[PDB]
Amino acid sequence: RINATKKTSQITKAMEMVSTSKLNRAEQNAKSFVPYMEKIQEVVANVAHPMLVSRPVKKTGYLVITSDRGLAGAYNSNVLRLVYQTIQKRHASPDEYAIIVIGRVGLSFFRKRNMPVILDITRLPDQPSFADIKEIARKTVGLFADGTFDELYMYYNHYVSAIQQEVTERKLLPLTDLAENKQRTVYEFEPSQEEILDVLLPQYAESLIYGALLDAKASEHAARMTAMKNATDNANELI
Amino acid sequence: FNLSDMLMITITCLIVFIIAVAATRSLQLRPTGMQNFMEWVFDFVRGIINSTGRFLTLGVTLIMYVFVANMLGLPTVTLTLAVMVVALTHYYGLKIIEEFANTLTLGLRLFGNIYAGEILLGLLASLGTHYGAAIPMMVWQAFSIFVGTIQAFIFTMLTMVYMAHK
Amino acid sequence: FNLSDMLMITITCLIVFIIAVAATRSLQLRPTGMQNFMEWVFDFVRGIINSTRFLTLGVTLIMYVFVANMLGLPATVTLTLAVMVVALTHYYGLKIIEEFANTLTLGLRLFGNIYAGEILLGLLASLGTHYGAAIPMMVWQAFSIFVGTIQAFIFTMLTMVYMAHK
Amino acid sequence: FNLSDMLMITITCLIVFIIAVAATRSLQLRPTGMQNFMEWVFDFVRGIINSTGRFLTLGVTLIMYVFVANMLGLPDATVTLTLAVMVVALTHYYGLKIIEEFANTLTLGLRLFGNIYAGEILLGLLASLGTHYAAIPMMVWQAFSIFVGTIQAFIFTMLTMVYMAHK
Amino acid sequence: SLGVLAAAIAVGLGALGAGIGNGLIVSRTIEGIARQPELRPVLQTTMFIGVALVEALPIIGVVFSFIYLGR
Amino acid sequence: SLGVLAAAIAVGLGALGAGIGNGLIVSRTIEGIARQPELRPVLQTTMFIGVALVEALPIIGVVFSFIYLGR
Amino acid sequence: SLGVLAAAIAVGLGALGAGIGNGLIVSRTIEGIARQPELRPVLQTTMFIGVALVEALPIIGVVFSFIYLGR
Amino acid sequence: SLGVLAAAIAVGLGALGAGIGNGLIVSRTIEGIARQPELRPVLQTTMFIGVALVEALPIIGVVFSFIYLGR
Amino acid sequence: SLGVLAAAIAVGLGALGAGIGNGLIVSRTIEGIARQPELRPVLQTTMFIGVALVEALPIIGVVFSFIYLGR
Amino acid sequence: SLGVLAAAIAVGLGALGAGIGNGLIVSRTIEGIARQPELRPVLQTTMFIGVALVEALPIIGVVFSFIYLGR
Amino acid sequence: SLGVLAAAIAVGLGALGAGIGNGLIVSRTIEGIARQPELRPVLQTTMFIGVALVEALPIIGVVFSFIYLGR
Amino acid sequence: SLGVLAAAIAVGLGALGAGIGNGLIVSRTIEGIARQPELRPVLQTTMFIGVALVEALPIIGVVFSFIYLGR
Amino acid sequence: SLGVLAAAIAVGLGALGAGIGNGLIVSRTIEGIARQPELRPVLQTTMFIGVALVEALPIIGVVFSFIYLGR
Amino acid sequence: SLGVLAAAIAVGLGALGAGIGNGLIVSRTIEGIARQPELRPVLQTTMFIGVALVEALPIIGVVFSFIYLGR
Amino acid sequence: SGGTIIYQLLMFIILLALLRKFAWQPLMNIMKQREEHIANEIDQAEKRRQEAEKLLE
Amino acid sequence: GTIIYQLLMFIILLALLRKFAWQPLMNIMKQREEHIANEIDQAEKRRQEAEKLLEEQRELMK
Amino acid sequence: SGGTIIYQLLMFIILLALLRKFAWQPLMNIMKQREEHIANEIDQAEKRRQEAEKLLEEQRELMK
Amino acid sequence: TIIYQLLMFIILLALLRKFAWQPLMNIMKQREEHIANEIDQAEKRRQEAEKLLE
Amino acid sequence: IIYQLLMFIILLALLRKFAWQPLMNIMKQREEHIANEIDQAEKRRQEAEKLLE
Amino acid sequence: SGGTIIYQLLMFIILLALLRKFAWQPLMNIMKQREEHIANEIDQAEKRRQEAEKLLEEQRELMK
Amino acid sequence: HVSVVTPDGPVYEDDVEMVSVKAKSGELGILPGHIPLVAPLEISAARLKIAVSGGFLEVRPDKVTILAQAAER
């Protein structure tokens, strides 16, 4: 008993330390990703169409974020519970109950619940690169452009503190809330504004698909570290 | 009266009648041969009317008669036809006099196109007979008939637009 | 001298005087009716001057020319007015010859606009009396009044920009 | 025949002869002086031909001949017409559209002749004015006439190359 | 009697105007089809209706010129 | 006399003006249709509105030319 | 004698000027309609107003042409 | 005696120039209005200012034609 | 007498109009072919029909000029 | 006399040129104002200087025409 | 007598049309070539079909003018 | 003696050629002023040099016309 | 003695056409080289060949004018 | 006799064409310098060669006109 | 001008009426009958499918 | 006759234009006067409210 | 009775022969394509009806 | 006639100015001064109230 | 055309033929300089590889 | 016109001299630029060959 | 500055006095003091005086930045 609990405490503390190191590693990428987002936001605000206005809705896809492995406190569960609640509330029809999953646990939960998975992706590294997500983002944005759905949404956890992993939601839907920049500079167009916007909009969509997932990875690492530290302290006091 | 013009009008009327009889000789669910061409032209005129039913028959007969008139020339009436079309369009439902002026102008333009084609063909034929450009004469007849056809469809489209506006 | 021109000038001056007296009959912090119109002309001329001391001169000139153009509804003067405006602009502060010709050209343009309007109106009235185009006559008078209003505004703006340049 | 025109043509032939002889008087590895200019013009015509080998030879001969023809005018229509006809025949033999193309070739030759005659007429008018009675305006006229002649020669060479490529 | 000259002048003016009109119309529809290949049938039907519309009046001008030459 | 020449000159000038105006008015329409194909009906409404306004001057001109030729 | 020729050509360039004039007036109208359909009524008011001044000068000529014809 | 055709060409040229100027004016101002729905009164006021500016030489030409006809 | 001048005027005006029309047409086809080279054949064809359409009135003008010269 | 016709031709040519130039100027000023809504002062000064330089020639032309007519 | 003048006006109008044609052609092709530096040979080929199509008519005009001047 | 006619038509042609040139010159300058205000002096100098260059041939034509009228 | 007038008219027409063509071509290639400086050699070569092609016809016109004046 | 007026019309058309030419030329180069301020000397040199190239022909026309006037 | 305009209009009206009542009514009726037969066949197929589904249920 | 005809035409024109021009000019003048009065009484009410607030603050401090 | 009418008739006959020999196929294949589209629609409707009837019979047999 | 017309125009302009335009300008300046005085009084009262409260 | 043919034959023959023969003496030498330099560099690389072995 | 031809020839010679006085430097500069380009192209290859040979000799000495 | 930026991070941020680039509309030669404009790249190898494989090109008279993904030297 004593040996077993000591071994469990040791291994849990060690892998919690690994989780903290992974959090520290991911924080660098999270802090370094900003300049691209700042530049694209400024350019889009300066410049500004099918995907710029709403339309009569008929279906809605629900993007979600989860983890390949479990062993988390609320990361993979709070988002799932909130998504299921809002789906059962709003999307009464199964046609409007369209969903998209990115995590293995979410995939298993939706397969058990018998949900119509349209597109999925799993087996991703701790610190992902663009090319591993570019194909999925392009597929989703092309589906939206062709018009299978009429509204997009993402659910995940945003990293605000190591002990606080707040859950929120965004809108990858037709772009309405654009923050006008203070210094509105008027540019010229070589291939004309219609084509400029038609090319830029998917770029903005597949850039907005980022940032959120980096924050989600940071939040999941923080939750793992905190839960494992709590478990290690519990094992130590039980021993 | 104009005996030659009356005889020509009767000739076109008889040609249109026999063409209609041949097209509607038999009726079934399978249009082939001449029936295929009749179905094709009916579909084309129906699509034109939809783009710009009750007047579909009138459009079909006017197109057929003007095509027969253009074809006959290969070997007053236009003004009367334009006046009748304008009266029918008005009765179906300075602006009015302006619209009548445009209708008369369109009729006179079609008449002038046919007259110019006929004059050029006659001059070429007389020149060849007196002192024989068979290939250029054939080309001349070819694009004169082509231009007459496009003028016919243009007049039909203009009449349909005027009727829709009225 | 020109007795008719002198009488017309005196009538226009009297009309301007009575209009100014009626506008300035009373003063208060709330301008209504004619007072509101005077306030809005003052605001408009002040805005024009700001966009492009002489505000009262511009207002008086605008009123004078507006009354003069309105009186025509029922060349020497224009030349004198242009010369006086040019002299005032010069005294306030090849190429010089062209600059001097430009003011006379503007004055002559205003004179010619009013002359063409008056000639057309007189010819139309004489023709109608001899053998009645009431609606076209009213349209012509309204068009001439509008053209004169734009010409007056353009003359005021040109005087303002010339003074600013000088 | 035209004795003066024949003598002038022989003069241009001899001038081209001595120019080519002087250009290729000595052979070495580094082209300098006249050799440098010859290498530069050879590279220029080679690049023009590549843009639009076997025909670079007579291309260079034609360019030099028209350059000399423009040259002696500073101090004829039959020759230009014959040259255009010969060029058209050579292009046809190397390989109403044909009649039209021949008309355009004759028009290009006549345009070169017309530019030459415009320069000659300007010079003759200046000489007549001098006889009736402008060194700087005469210098400007001579300079821009020679310049326009050089550009016309280049344009004729390019058009001939294009026609040969099309054929 | 200068009637032939008058008729020829009218015919030439009509020809110049018609040439300018067809050049403009057909150049614009060429630009359109180059821009978007999908709308080709609509572009051509608009092409023909427009060219007939512009060429209408010069035909009447030529007819009047022939009448004047006869007179 | 000179009446025939005057009438022909008037007819030719009117024809040239009408042709140029109609061509310019219709040129942009193909590009507009190619850009948005959905506005086809309203584009034909503005087709057949205003073309008559442009052509009104040529019609009055040729009528006056015929009057002058009659003298 | 020459007055009839003078009067006939007087409305000649006037028709040509008016036709060439308002031709560009309506071509830009459709361009705004194609770019934005919600502003259809406001554009129509401007073009209807604009053509009035475009044809204003020829109206002066035709009346003056009648006077020249009479003399 | 022959000043009638002089007056005629004067008024015709003036009208033609005024028509071209007005057509360009209205085309560009309505294009700008379509580009930006706001500043409509500013655009209209500036366009009337431009119309008054352009309609200056033709009026003087008409007056010159009148006095030449008188002579 | 005047027939030669009439024929020359007609031929020149027809040549002017044809030159303008063909110039615009093949310039815009070059613009399109530079835009996208893939549709090169269909642009060449459409420009063939365009050239055939524009070069129609000048032929009739030349024929009428020959007839008038004969007269 | 003939000098009256000469002066009228000169006046008409000058009026046409001035109208074309100043119409182009004012249309471009409208375009510039639409592009930048806060450059009205400098735009207006440039407008007036441009029309002044453009119309400089027509005044001298009119003066010379009057001198020739007097001659 | 008048035949030489008729021939001169014919060749002048033909030159006008031809020059305007190929000038516009080569200008638009320069613009396209500067847009796309590669794909030069296809445009350089289309040069000459375009120029020949533009210049076909004026050669016939010049031949007819020479024939008329002979008479 | 048509010397007055010659001088007046020469002056009118010179003015007509000049005015459009100056207007088309200054239009693009004001467009550039609207586009980028920071280069006003250099565009002003280029404008003035362009107008000075353009208004050279009309001056020589005016002097030649005066000489011809004297002769 | 009308041959001199015919030759002068032909020369003037040819000069105007050549000027228009050369202006269009060199103005377009100015922007062509302004957009990308690295293409200057190719752009200037096609520049020169194009202006030569444009000026080809005016030389023939001048030659024909000289022949007519001599005749 | 008519040689003076022949020279006058020749120089008038030459000046008009040259004016349109260099006006277009200066407008395009001014647009170019507005586009890219760093290429000022090279744009200036290109415009300087272009103006001479376009204006070459009108000088020859003026010389021919002077010769005709002497004749 | 002439006096054949009234005769031409009467002939056109007579030709319209005769051609209509002779061929146009039969041809239009045949086309409408073919369209109605296609619609009836589609409706019969749909009814058969619905009956099959009901029998399966 | 011509003078009286012109006078009658002018009177008819004025009568016709009265109905079509009274509403726009009166509406514009009323809007301008309303804007001026709005500025004036907004300033007056702001001053009165500021004075009342000053008095209330003094009373509260006291 | 001049030969102009005979010459025009001969030219028309030659033009008709050339037009037939050069454009018989383009019109014939278009007409055949329209007929084939109509026949394909009719055959699709008939096949759908037959399949529905067969499915109904099979369902009835399975129920029985 | 030109000199007399110019003198009459100058005299009329001066008389109209000194009779009404000076009084009209005085009235306009009085209205503007009243508005400015009201604005300044409001600003001063607000500043004094803020200072007293603080 | 005989004299023009003689002159053109000379221009395309003889003189220009010999001139093209001499211009090769410079062009081929300039090319062979670089060719020999490349060959020597390759030989030196082979020697360096042999030293490494 | 023997005297006119001689005067024209003298004027052309003077014009050629005046034009050369301003054009001798640019043409010579262009020729010198071409010569410098060719010389640099040859010298780069020569230096590359020499450096390769020196490197081979150094490698052989190190191997020995 | 002709600094390029990718979602992973920056690649090069050096200064330059000459910029060349092939865009979808055509080739562009950028100089300091250029008017602001926007142009999209189409699998082009931008050269300064690297590859882009899809991206956007913005220009400012001060400096130019080419934001794109999958860019290597």
Residue numbers in the entry:
A (entry chain D): 10 to 57, 65 to 255
B (entry chain B): 15 to 66, 73 to 95, 114 to 131, 154 to 191, 198 to 232
C (entry chain A): 15 to 66, 74 to 95, 113 to 131, 154 to 191, 198 to 232
D (entry chain C): 15 to 66, 73 to 95, 112 to 131, 154 to 191, 199 to 232
E (entry chain M), F (entry chain L), G (entry chain U), H (entry chain T), I (entry chain N), J (entry chain S), ...: 2 to 72
O (entry chain K): 7 to 63
P (entry chain F): 9 to 70
Q (entry chain J), T (entry chain H): 7 to 70
The study reports:
Because of the lower resolution of the Fo region, focused refinement with Fo was conducted by masking the Fo region. The refined structure achieved resolutions of 3.5–6.6 Å, confirming that the peripheral stalk always accompanies Fo a-subunits. In the triple-stalk FoF1, all three a-subunits interacted with the c-ring. Each a-subunit interacted with three neighboring c-subunits, forming an a1c3 unit. Therefore, a total of nine c-subunits interacted with the a-subunits, leaving the remaining c-subunit at the open position (gap) between two a-subunits. As a result, the three a-subunits were not positioned exactly 120° apart from each other. The spatial intervals between the a-subunits are not perfectly symmetric because of the symmetry mismatch between the ring structures of F1 and Fo, that is, threefold versus tenfold. Thus, at the current resolution, the overall structures of the three a-subunits in the triple-stalk FoF1 were essentially identical to each other and closely resembled that of the wild-type Bacillus PS3 FoF1. This suggests that all a-subunits are functional, which is consistent with the aforementioned biochemical analyses showing the enhanced H+/ATP ratio. The structure of the triple-stalk FoF1 clearly showed that the c10 ring can accommodate up to three a-subunits, but not more than four due to spatial constraints.
